[PDB]
């Protein structure tokens, strides 16, 4: 029995809210004490570009941005039964990274 | 020598006149002979129902 922390990072929330809810009820069905999904503040990345290949124009900038959503789940589980909980929902936009308990 | 300053309430606002649209028309009463009424042209924001402050009177108006 450990105190492990799974971290879930994604770029779209509707593809992450399905994966993060899969890990909660996936461990409520397997009767673990699960601290709920804790939602970190998002990370918007805001490259702004001149939009013109030359320098001629009316100076119209070009605001690109990319939000990064990060949610983390803390468990109360041993090292074995979490592996079939981890390896059942990839959903390629989500990067599930499981940390270690002791640290 | 001068005519006394006679006050005057304002009936309906009748639109905006003046080249740049600065002046309205107000069709005042006098609050002394309320049967008597003269259309005039104020400048500034009006709010129909207020009281003006006219000096001399018997001026003019051109109906818009």
């Amino acid at each position: 029995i450990h105190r492990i922390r799974i971290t879930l990072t994604s770029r779209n929330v509707k593809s992450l809210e399905k994966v993060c809810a899969d890990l909660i009820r996936g461990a409520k069905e397997k009767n673990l004490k699960v601290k709920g999904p804790v939602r970190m503040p998002t990370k918007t990345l805001r490259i702004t570009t001149r939009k013109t290949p030359c320098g001629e124009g009316s100076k119209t900038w070009d605001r690109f941005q990319m939000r990064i959503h990060k949610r983390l789940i803390d468990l109360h589980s041993p090292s074995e039964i979490v592996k079939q909980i981890t390896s059942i929902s990839i959903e390629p936009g989500v990067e599930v990274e499981v940390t270690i308990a002791d640290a | 020598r001068v005519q006394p300053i006679k006050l005057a309430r304002v009936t309906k606002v009748l639109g905006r006149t003046g080249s740049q649209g600065q002046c309205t028309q107000v069709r005042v009463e006098f609050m002394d002979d309320t049967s008597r009424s003269i259309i005039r042209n104020v400048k500034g924001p009006v709010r129909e129902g207020d009281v003006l402050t006219l000096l001399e009177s018997e001026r003019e108006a051109r109906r818009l």
Binding site: - | G18, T24, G44, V51, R59
Partner: protein, 189 residues
């Protein structure tokens, strides 16, 4: 009842002219402690008329770009200037201020379409809000220009503008450019 600036009562002042009684804004209901409020009086036409006249005086004093958002600087300027009015005269400055709005708002102005060699063409009446808009504007300009490089402080030149304006002298900057507007309007009536 409310004692604006902590020490100036308001249920004794009288308005002279019947016209400006709904645009001069000192009496019973909306008389506050301080002339500083999160206003929201610019969102609607004529919402600035039920704005208290001491709030309006502070809002027009922070104007030449040097001091443009500095309101808490011009809260005390009107605060100090009221204590100078009390010492120079011996009277409630809320009375002295509303006798200055009367005696400095013009009653006649000029504008219309065509040629203008000196000012304008047609004699036009003045609504009783622009003569509250402009009477505050003249008292804030006579205060500002008198103390531009003089030894006198700004609350002195604010007091000495409207002590001399509420009396009626043509020795203040306001009445000098109040009768300048109605003289030239009497010219091209």
């Amino acid at each position: 009842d409310i004692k604006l600036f902590g020490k100036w009562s308001t249920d004794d002042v009288q308005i002279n002219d019947i016209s400006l009684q709904d645009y001069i804004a000192v009496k019973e209901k909306y008389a506050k402690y301080l002339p500083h409020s999160a206003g929201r009086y610019a969102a609607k036409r004529f919402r600035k008329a039920q704005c208290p006249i001491v709030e309006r005086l502070t809002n027009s004093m922070m104007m030449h770009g040097r001091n443009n958002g500095k309101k808490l600087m011009t809260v005390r300027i009107v605060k100090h200037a009221f204590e100078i009015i009390h010492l120079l005269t011996g009277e409630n400055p809320l009375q002295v201020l509303v006798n200055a709005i009367i005696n400095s708002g013009p009653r006649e102005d000029s504008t219309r379409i065509g040629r203008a060699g000196t000012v304008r063409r047609q004699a036009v009446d003045v609504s009783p809000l622009r003569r509250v808009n402009q009477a505050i504007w003249l008292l804030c300009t006579g205060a500002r220009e008198a103390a531009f490089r003089n030894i006198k402080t700004i609350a002195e030149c604010l007091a000495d503008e409207l002590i001399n304006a509420a009396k009626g002298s043509s020795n203040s900057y306001a009445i000098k450019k109040k009768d300048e507007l109605e003289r030239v309007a009497k010219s091209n009536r």
